[PDB]
Design a binder for this molecule. Structure first.
Ligand SMILES: *CC(=O)N(CCCNC(=O)C(F)(F)F)c1ccc([N+](=O)[O-])cc1
Ligand SMILES: *CC(=O)N(CCCNC(=O)C(F)(F)F)c1ccc([N+](=O)[O-])cc1
Ligand SMILES: *CC(=O)N(CCCNC(=O)C(F)(F)F)c1ccc([N+](=O)[O-])cc1
Ligand SMILES: *CC(=O)N(CCCNC(=O)C(F)(F)F)c1ccc([N+](=O)[O-])cc1
Lengths: 239, 239
């Protein structure tokens, strides 16, 4: 398990990705990178993982991604792909197995429009972990409710188990990581007025790919406290 | 030409889109909607246009797009697609003719990553038209230069005429509308330190699709003054 320790400042740049594998630069508690890892697992793609210390980054990491953000994919041809949704779409197109995006152009566009309806939530979760008292908290809960209602309306018309149909698909994996963190953030009462979205969270936790990657509330809390301290040890919490 | 007048508050909701055509809800001076119109023209797609008065919207327009924004596509099946990049990608996949996106997954991802490098520019152009004096202007010019340098680096490695190759393609059409407005915004000196990007603007203006859709500096200025007044007549400037 210690082989999952992150690479930080001073680390040597890694060698080439072996043929037959793809590499993801990740961080174990990063929801953006969890998107890509959910897709790797759902499609059964052989891969290796390099975790980056996001509080003490290797200088060489900026050669993998100018933005210095995870996730990044690197394949055996030496190609580099970043931005979470871009990496996920690349993986769906480039590898065989279950297609997580519809072939139909409209239904694929529909998945993207649902992603747009979700698009304010990640920055809200940002504000939430910043929140300082019960007044800020009450305000944040109402902001989440407003965004959640948008998603509830989609499920209400479709009456499907998942956002893309009765089968879990790309859109579900793209939005899941922020809902995963909701509990531990004590934002679980925001889904009370959105019953279908609440049932959707239950179905997601039953998905084999989701379940395999889910982090315990306790581990997430450990990370978050160190993260909020700007600790160089946050990314390796538990190792 | 008066048939291009916008529909506003009080207008009747339109009837169905005829078979064999797709409809775009647009506005003549809107760069986000220009993306979609560039793609419609480049692919030779038969279409009709409904311009929306964005300062005095029809209530029914919120039934086409909850966000109340253009562009929106509506086809003869009654399907609705919004968000500029989503509409463009849908059109490329759903219609025949020149494919504006690569089939290759990596090269398609590369186009999307270039879009991400551009992603701060539209909100900057927003700030720019807000700018109040020569001090704000000097500051804005440096912000544009920083973003333009990112794009210059791409062209420097690729040494291609366009961002996706030697043939104009999706990525070029997606970023063009903001560069179109640069002149009239007096931001044309921002590309001085980015020579390849400057030559790219010249090549774009030579493209038949771009040229066909380009708005004169004078018309754009007329719109902008009314827009900045919150005029209900801004969207119909010149009609
Ligand atoms: C990797 C990742 O997703 N992020 C950005 C989101 C961080 N916020 C949260 O996890 C949430 F708000 F709780 F959801 C990221 C970026 C940087 C670090 N870091 O350790 O410096 C961690 C996570
Ligand atoms: C893809 C999807 O599920 N959407 C967005 C598609 C276009 N929107 C519409 O058709 C509109 F809502 F009528 F404008 C979606 C989003 C929301 C609902 N809903 O029941 O409110 C349906 C479909
Ligand atoms: C349609 C469109 O793109 N917009 C948003 C961008 C507006 N800014 C500019 O045109 C730029 F900054 F100069 F580039 C839009 C939205 C609303 C209106 N409106 O008339 O209310 C116009 C344009
Ligand atoms: C698609 C593209 O042109 N890109 C981004 C691809 C991945 N990035 C890289 O390979 C990296 F730059 F090495 F990290 C692109 C962007 C910028 C350049 N450049 O010459 O700086 C090349 C390619």
């Amino acid at each position: 398990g210690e082989s999952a320790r992150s690479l930080g400042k001073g680390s040597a740049p890694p060698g080439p990705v072996p043929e037959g594998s793809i590499r993801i630069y990740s961080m174990r508690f990063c929801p953006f990178a969890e998107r890509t890892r959910l897709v790797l697992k759902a499609k059964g793609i052989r891969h290796e993982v390099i975790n980056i210390n996001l509080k003490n980054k290797p200088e060489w990491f900026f050669k993998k991604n100018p933005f210095g953000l995870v996730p990044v994919l690197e394949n055996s041809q030496g190609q580099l792909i970043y931005e979470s949704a871009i990496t996920c779409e690349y993986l769906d197109e480039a590898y065989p197995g279950k297609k997580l995006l519809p072939d139909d152009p409209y239904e694929k566009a529909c998945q993207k429009m649902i992603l747009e309806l979700f698009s304010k939530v990640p920055s809200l979760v940002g504000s939430f972990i910043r929140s300082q008292n019960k007044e800020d908290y009450a305000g944040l809960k109402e902001e989440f409710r407003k965004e959640f209602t948008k998603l509830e309306e989609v499920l209400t018309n479709k009456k499907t188990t998942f956002f893309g149909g009765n089968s879990i698909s790309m859109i579900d994996y793209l939005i899941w990581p922020w809902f995963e963190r909701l509990e531990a953030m004590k934002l679980n009462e925001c889904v009370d007025h959105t019953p279908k979205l609440k049932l959707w969270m239950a179905a997601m936790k039953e998905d084999p790919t989701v379940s395999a990657l889910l982090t315990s509330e306790k581990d997430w809390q450990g990370f978050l406290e160190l993260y909020l301290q700007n600790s160089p040890e946050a990314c390796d919490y538990g190792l």
